[PDB]
């Protein structure tokens, strides 16, 4: 899937392009209706940012001309423009690189962002990642109603966390609990063990429960002291 | 309690040699009269053949039908019994086991399971069963060598599935079935591993 997918959309790349807009949600549908470079929104990090990409001329328009009535944009650095009626006329390729797959049952709950419910491992296959290719994910709306059903750990798994904002911006408004914790893996100014150990502690010091005997494969448990009591003066005439 | 471990099991062809091992762990080996006892389908136990420890002698006794066939050694120095099988028969594909004690058949090890084969190894055949009587499946025939996987729908339906042990014929290659059972889409996926092939074949219902 991930090579093949690579070097389907190398071919594209190089042609249109993307850049991440805050200033609302069908707001933004109706400033760029007048253009047909769009069929959908391509993601929504939350409800109040979105992402359009699109064909070069089109998303320069839009880009010099909301630039004087709002929320600044941001051009994303992307050779190619997904999410976009621009992948359809390149379906074939794509169905005969992976028309070959065997979907096994999934152990955990993998919770879709393209169908917006929780699938089954036997439901993927060429179709399910090019609708995933193709149409949007709704990535808010998912750690929304996520964080209603009883998860209160959304731990973060990548070189550099960039959707913490959006992640806190979206179960800050559900009716859940709100000191659900959310923790990255890296950072940009670290990749060694210390920092992935300071992540860890920091999921661990608000409720998960973290085995602390893999780090110290070679040590002995030492002598230690006790806990230290804070005593009052508790005394009934005897 | 203590252990018997085993080894040497495989494929044969007939009429030639092959030679198991069997070391003990626990106890003195230089003491123990050991016993050795065949196992094939279709049949119970069979006692073949025993060897007399040492500070007895070195007599060894066979069974009939194997007298001038089998041979049994041991080394208590290294502490091995052995059995040296010249000139096999297609009859005896069979797990052994090596029993402690001459007459007190007391302990029993784990076994391995040797067989002699005729027939070279060759992909199955999957034929769809069409009820003509609700039940529906699928045979595998003429495979080799064990053993084979039956799945249904990928590993989605696995209740009323009924699996069959793959009884040998009269020919040397291996066939069962595989029904399940559904009121009233349907396909079994059969996959023979040292062959490398998987079939995905539908069944009518």
């Given at each position: 899937?991930?090579?093949?997918?690579?070097?389907?959309?190398?071919?594209?790349?190089?042609?249109?392009?993307?850049?991440?807009?805050?200033?609302?949600?069908?707001?933004?549908?109706?400033?760029?209706?007048?253009?047909?470079?769009?069929?959908?929104?391509?993601?929504?990090?939350?409800?109040?940012?979105?992402?359009?990409?699109?064909?070069?001329?089109?998303?320069?328009?839009?880009?010099?001309?909301?630039?004087?009535?709002?929320?600044?944009?941001?051009?994303?650095?992307?050779?190619?423009?997904?999410?976009?009626p621009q992948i359809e006329r390149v379906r074939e390729e794509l169905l005969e690189t992976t028309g070959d797959i065997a979907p096994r049952p999934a152990?955990?709950?993998?919770?879709?962002?393209?169908?917006?419910?929780?699938?089954?491992?036997?439901?993927?296959?060429?179709?399910?990642?090019?609708?995933?290719?193709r149409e949007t994910v709704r990535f808010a709306d998912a750690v929304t109603r996520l964080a209603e059903s009883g998860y209160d750990a959304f731990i973060?798994?990548?070189?550099?966390?960039?959707?913490?904002?959006?992640?806190?911006?979206?179960?800050?408004?559900?009716?859940?609990?709100?000191?659900?914790?959310?923790?990255?893996?890296?950072?940009?100014?670290?990749?060694?063990?210390?920092?992935?150990?300071?992540?860890?502690?920091?999921?661990?010091?608000?409720?998960?429960?973290?085995?602390?005997?893999?780090?110290?494969?070679?040590?002995?448990?030492?002598?230690?002291?006790?806990?230290?009591?804070?005593?009052?003066?508790?005394?009934?005439?005897? | 309690?203590?252990?018997?471990?085993?080894?040497?099991?495989?494929?044969?062809?007939?009429?030639?040699?092959?030679?198991?091992?069997?070391?003990?762990?626990?106890?003195?080996?230089?003491?123990?009269?050991?016993?050795?006892?065949?196992?094939?389908?279709?049949?119970?136990?069979?006692?073949?053949?025993?060897?007399?420890?040492?500070?007895?002698?070195?007599?060894?006794?066979?069974?009939?039908?194997?007298?001038?066939?089998?041979?049994?050694?041991?080394?208590?120095?290294?502490?091995?019994?052995?059995?040296?099988?010249?000139?096999?028969?297609?009859?005896?594909?069979?797990?052994?086991?090596?029993?402690?004690?001459?007459?007190?058949?007391?302990?029993?090890?784990?076994?391995?399971?040797?067989?002699?084969?005729?027939?070279?190894?060759?992909?199955?055949?999957?034929?769809?069963?069409?009820?003509?009587?609700?039940?529906?499946?699928?045979?595998?025939?003429?495979?080799?060598?064990?053993?084979?996987?039956?799945?249904?729908?990928?590993?989605?339906?696995?209740?009323?599935?009924?699996?069959?042990?793959?009884?040998?014929?009269?020919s040397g290659l291996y066939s069962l079935s595989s029904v399940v059972t559904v009121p009233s889409t349907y396909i079994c996926n059969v996959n023979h591993?040292?062959?490398?092939?998987?079939?995905?074949?539908?069944?009518?219902?």
């Open positions: 899937l991930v090579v093949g997918r690579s070097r389907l959309m190398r071919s594209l790349s190089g042609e249109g392009g993307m850049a991440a807009v805050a200033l609302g949600e069908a707001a933004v549908r109706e400033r760029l209706r007048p253009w047909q470079d769009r069929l959908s929104v391509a993601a929504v990090n939350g409800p109040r940012s979105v992402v359009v990409s699109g064909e070069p001329g089109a998303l320069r328009a839009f880009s010099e001309d909301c630039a004087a009535e709002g929320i600044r944009v941001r051009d994303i650095d992307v050779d190619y423009a997904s999410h976009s152990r955990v709950t993998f919770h879709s962002t393209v169908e917006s419910r929780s699938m089954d491992g036997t439901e993927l296959d060429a179709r399910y990642w090019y609708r995933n290719l973060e798994v990548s070189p550099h966390p960039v959707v913490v904002q959006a992640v806190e911006e979206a179960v800050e408004e559900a009716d859940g609990a709100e000191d659900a914790v959310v923790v990255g893996s890296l950072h940009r100014d670290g990749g060694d063990l210390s920092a992935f150990l300071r992540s860890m502690a920091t999921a661990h010091v608000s409720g998960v429960d973290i085995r602390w005997d893999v780090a110290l494969p070679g040590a002995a448990p030492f002598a230690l002291p006790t806990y230290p009591f804070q005593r009052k003066r508790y005394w009934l005439q005897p | 309690e203590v252990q018997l471990v085993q080894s040497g099991g495989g494929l044969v062809q007939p009429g030639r040699s092959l030679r198991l091992s069997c070391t003990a762990s626990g106890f003195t080996f230089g003491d123990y009269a050991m016993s050795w006892v065949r196992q094939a389908p279709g049949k119970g136990l069979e006692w073949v053949g025993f060897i007399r420890s040492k500070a007895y002698g070195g007599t060894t006794e066979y069974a009939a039908s194997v007298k001038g066939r089998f041979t049994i050694s041991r080394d208590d120095s290294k502490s091995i019994a052995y059995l040296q099988m010249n000139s096999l028969k297609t009859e005896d594909t069979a797990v052994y086991y090596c029993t402690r004690g001459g007459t007190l058949f007391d302990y029993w090890g784990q076994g391995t399971l040797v067989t002699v084969s005729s027939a070279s190894t060759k992909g199955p055949s999957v034929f769809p069963l069409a009820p003509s009587s609700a039940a529906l499946g699928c045979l595998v025939k003429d495979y080799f060598p064990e053993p084979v996987t039956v799945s249904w729908n990928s590993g989605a339906l696995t209740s009323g599935v009924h699996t069959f042990p793959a009884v040998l014929q009269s591993k040292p062959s490398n092939t998987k079939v995905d074949k539908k069944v009518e219902p």
